[PDB]
Amino acid sequence: MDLNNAYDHCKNIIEKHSKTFSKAFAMLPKHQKRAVWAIYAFCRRADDIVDEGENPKEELEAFAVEFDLFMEGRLETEDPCWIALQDAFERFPLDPAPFYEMIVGQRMDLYPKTIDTKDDLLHYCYHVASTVGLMLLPVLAPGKVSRVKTGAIELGYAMQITNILRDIGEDLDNHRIYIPKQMMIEYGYTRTDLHNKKVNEAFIQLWEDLAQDAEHYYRNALATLPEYPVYSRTPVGGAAKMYRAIIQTVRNNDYQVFGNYVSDQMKKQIIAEMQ
Template identity: 55%
Template sequence: MNDLMKAYHHCESIIKEHSKTFYKAFMLLPKEKKLAVWAVYAFCRQVDDIVDEGLSPKEELFVFKEMFADFLNGELPSDDPMWLALQDVFQRYEMDVQSFHDMIIGQEMDLYKKLYYTEEEVLHYSYHVASTVGLMLLPILAPKKKNALRKDAIALGQAMQITNILRDIGEDLERDRIYIPIDKLERAGYSLDDLNNRILNNKFISVWEEMANKAEGLYEQALSTIHLYPMHSRTPVKGAAYLYRAILGSIRKKGYSVFKTKHFVTSEEKQQIISQI
């Protein structure tokens, strides 16, 4: 196996370990495109890990940004195989460099901002941490339609990130982070004290549902142009959207227990969803 294939397999092992949902959805792509998706995912994961697990994340992120600048100047900034795989992706596809920069900005927000007050702020954050990934993938998934699909790829990323937020409320509280809009909670008569005390009542559920409805509207928007994707990309994108959207149904079914339980769609349910697409 040559060095490039080893690098791609390294990227595959990262997505396989960290995102079984995306791995399952994008397994359906032709081989070359699938490898490219693994490389983009490995890049995003590295930034994510620096912010969430780095010992001195601000400094580490600064170093990573310098490395990315070197990479864009045609260098391989380190012997991390991710860069070798990504270099091949950038040679094969017309990648959207700005979306890579914007994703790093989004991850950086987590180092400085822990409270989100309005839906607008949440959507702005969701664009940076999630929609950007869709924009990175568009030149791979739909090279001839990437401009026509841009707006709805952004909507899909926002829908997925709001789904993450609604699933991870308890986990985020542990890290002193609140992404569910505080002004909506307060308008519903549900205080920050209630949230910190993990009180699950109708006021909380009404806000959770308002955000879930927002996400569902964004999923609908994203799927309205699914026919513009080439045939081979259509099922993976649809699959990722359906698998993520199913998380909302799973949370409802389990009585909105987002403070204590990490909700996920089981392997059997995933199989069933994918087979129906």
Template identity: 55%
Template sequence: MMNRSTAYEECESIIKLHSKTFHRAFSLLPKNQRNAVWAIYAFCRTVDDIVDENEHPKEELQLFEEEFQQFLSGNVNMKDAKWLALQDVFANYNMNTDAFLAMIEGQKMDIENKSYGSFEDVLDYSYHVASTVGLMLLPVLAPKTHDKLIDSAVQLGYAMQITNILRDVGEDLERGRVYLPQELMDKHGYTYSMLEQMENNSQFKLLWEEMAQLAEMYYDRAMTTIHEYPVYSRPPVKGAAILYRAILDEVRGNDYNVFTVKNYVSGQSKEKILSAHME
């Protein structure tokens, strides 16, 4: 049987591979909280990969949901690193089970929905796939004040998911998904035909900027309650927000090319940004 230390190490290897930004930010936490974040990320990554990388995502997601229900009932697969680590997390923190279930519902939306009509629809999707992550993390990051931070965690999830959407327009298009809401496309005169042709024209830039400025508004809102976090949690939460927000400026610096370029903040730039913004 795998021990908990090995399980956490395996979970950390997953976040190291898939999200250097989050790994860099949350490495600032004390060990126990850091390990809990790795375990929660491993859960989220598993659900995400089922939908993005699996030939039969609907069936696999159903199996995963059943496995999670088994986990909640105490029937834990002790050979699986994510479940073993997560069992330890659930034993030590007052976890929000509804957030985990809502995350699974969000991944179902990716299977069923290929486009979105309104910006409100995009926010609803963003809540399910991103704000839920913040709600999962809150009992770990702010065990005594997490009830005061629910709204800001939701806002930060909105901000980060809209950033993902704006960074991954081309990649999502290849998967047959469009997260740019129809109402904003219509508002700026940007058509599906233009999108399919990957036209980076003035209409697209106006559409992209409107969504980016909404994301920046949500980042600002999320940071208004940073003082409610314990001192040890403030740097990683603020750091994650700052580093993710910086992706928007990377896209701007690349003349809004989100079709043929993967925009990211380099390791060197991350350190510069953190040193400039962290107090």
């Protein structure tokens, strides 16, 4: 297909995966929006290989090999995702380094893993979420990367921690735990408590501890919003605030995370306030 239809393929991927990010980034000007769709599709394919694929090691290694060929300018393909990404790399000064770092992060999920400390948690969040922010920065803030970089990394932390806090039960059903072990020890929330899906006062203490770290990172990220060009402020601030709202949604549902969505109407409220 031609470039328009290659980008349209990527628009469908983001629209199907995330109402929050699709709605936020649709507000960008044309070529920035299309580049974000292509970059998002690269992240989505990597994460889907590891989180949903049948042999994730072999399939992720093949994905990494293809991206190597892509960066050498030598990938010949009809895959719409690569056609779109080729244009984005040629149209904006995208840096391959965070793309490689994302693949490093996805490798972290291939084998059994225990998060021991908050520092362990942030190392994981950096490689699977902060890198996405770094991938997007040349599109969202041309010429201003170094002054918004730290906020973008911390927005990554905030969003990934939020994801983890929403998904404790879903991840447990998949034999994954991202809650730091030292935090379960600090608050007396045992593996047996988690296994029984117990929402007790120790659970809430631990959950709120992590949630407050996420809230701190969101606040730090939002403080950098005036340094973005005007056309990125509502997309980035809107993405940040709709994802942050997952936290209060879980609180309002009494921390029941063993069975949470910001409502369509609430997303529209947040976007309207940004605008």
